[PDB]
Design a protein around this ligand. Structure first.
Ligand SMILES: CC(=O)N[C@H]1[C@H](O[C@H]2C[C@@H](C(=O)NCCS(=O)(=O)O)[NH2+][C@@H]2CO)O[C@H](CO)[C@@H](OS(=O)(=O)O)[C@@H]1O
Ligand SMILES: [Zn+2]
Ligand SMILES: [Zn+2]
Ligand SMILES: [Zn+2]
Ligand SMILES: [Zn+2]
Ligand SMILES: [Zn+2]
Ligand SMILES: [Zn+2]
Ligand SMILES: [Zn+2]
Length: 327
């Protein structure tokens, strides 16, 4: 069972090469019609993996490193593909949320808080660490069997246990493949295995995996409560959309009820690590470049005369970063 060394890392071409290095489930796969069936779906519908991978490039490095640190099967790095298409905003009919598709009750078990301001199930780092802990615990409950653990992740430990017991009573084997599970769960395991077979040897299937570098996409940066993502976007010259995709838990795009931390693009990490205390949870107006008394007055539906009356100006000519009281 390979334990990964970080000294291997500089030699990987991209994320897919790195991911395969940590696969643990490939040897014990075998012919089962159910796997081939899923594989054919992927081969016939290639845009699914392609679009999942594009969205995946924000998150996949993070997931791979967490799985490597715990020596867990790197095939689980593909679980968000089949769960959510690596879309943290995905919401199932069961109200499964985030990359890992936690239902409300299971989210609550793992203390992934759900408030008007914050949904921990969408939180990339919190939901990833909870999902890996849940999968490890399920693996431990089923005597180290990853197939049953995956089945239980989808259907619940209870459903899988009762199915095992029922087979025992009937005198049938109790491995995953022999349990008569709901169709979603019957498909779940072979789907992940099929996808992992393609990722393991994509050339042999005529698949081209989306190029994704073997580099971090984001860094965690300390932030105060009550900051708007728009304010951070402006400070760092970023698209608010990118920050939201990295911090999907913050339903109202303000840092409340969460980790007091923002994931930010690597290229802005140094700047924001240095800068993020200048923003303050938020009458007063900060004069921009290109502002005049007139333009400011127009924006606030007041008159220039009222605006001058409310301040103690040496001249009409404003300076960038100057503070004005708005009447
Ligand atoms: C990660 C997670 O929350 N797993 C939970 C799982 O969700 C599944 C549900 C599924 C889902 O959303 N199905 C419907 C999809 S669709 O909207 O109908 O297409 N996706 C999730 C992860 O695989 O539902 C089962 C059963 O309730 C839960 O087991 S139990 O609570 O112990 O019984 C289990 O905890
Ligand atoms: Zn070991
Ligand atoms: Zn390795
Ligand atoms: Zn699901
Ligand atoms: Zn094991
Ligand atoms: Zn960028
Ligand atoms: Zn007025
Ligand atoms: Zn001047």
């Amino acid at each position: 069972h390979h334990h990964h060394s970080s000294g291997e890392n500089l030699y990987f071409q991209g994320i897919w090469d790195r991911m395969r290095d940590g696969f643990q489930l490939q040897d014990a796969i075998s012919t089962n019609p159910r796997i081939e069936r899923q594989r054919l779906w992927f081969l016939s519908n290639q845009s699914f993996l392609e679009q999942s991978s594009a969205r995946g490039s924000l998150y996949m490095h993070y997931v791979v490193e967490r799985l490597e640190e715990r020596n867990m099967p790197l095939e689980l790095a593909l679980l968000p593909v089949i769960e959510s298409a690596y879309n943290p905003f995905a919401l199932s009919r069961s109200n499964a949320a985030g990359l890992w598709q936690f239902i409300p009750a299971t989210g609550q078990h793992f203390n992934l808080r759900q408030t008007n301001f914050y949904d921990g199930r969408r939180d990339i780092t919190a939901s990833t660490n909870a999902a890996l802990t849940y999968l490890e615990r399920l693996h431990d409950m089923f005597n180290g069997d990853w197939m049953l653990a995956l089945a239980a992740y989808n259907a619940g430990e209870g459903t899988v246990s009762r199915a095992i017991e029922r087979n025992e009573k009937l005198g049938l084997p109790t491995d995953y493949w022999n349990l008569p599970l709901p169709q979603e769960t019957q498909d779940y395991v072979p789907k992940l295995l099929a996808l992992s077979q393609i990722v393991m040897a994509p050339d042999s299937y005529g698949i081209s995996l989306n190029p994704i570098n073997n580099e971090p996409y984001f860094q965690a940066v300390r932030v105060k409560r009550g900051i708007d993502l728009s304010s951070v976007a402006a400070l760092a010259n970023l698209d608010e959309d990118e920050l939201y995709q990295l911090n999907p838990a913050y339903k109202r795009r303000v840092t409340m009820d969460g980790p007091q931390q923002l994931l930010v693009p690597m290229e802005k990490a140094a700047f924001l690590t240095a800068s993020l205390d200048t923003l303050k949870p938020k009458q007063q107006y900060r004069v921009r470049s290109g502002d005049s008394l007139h333009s400011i007055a127009n924006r606030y539906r007041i008159t220039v005369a009222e605006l001058k009356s409310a301040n103690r100006l040496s001249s009409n000519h404003l300076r960038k970063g100057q503070q004005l009281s708005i009447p």
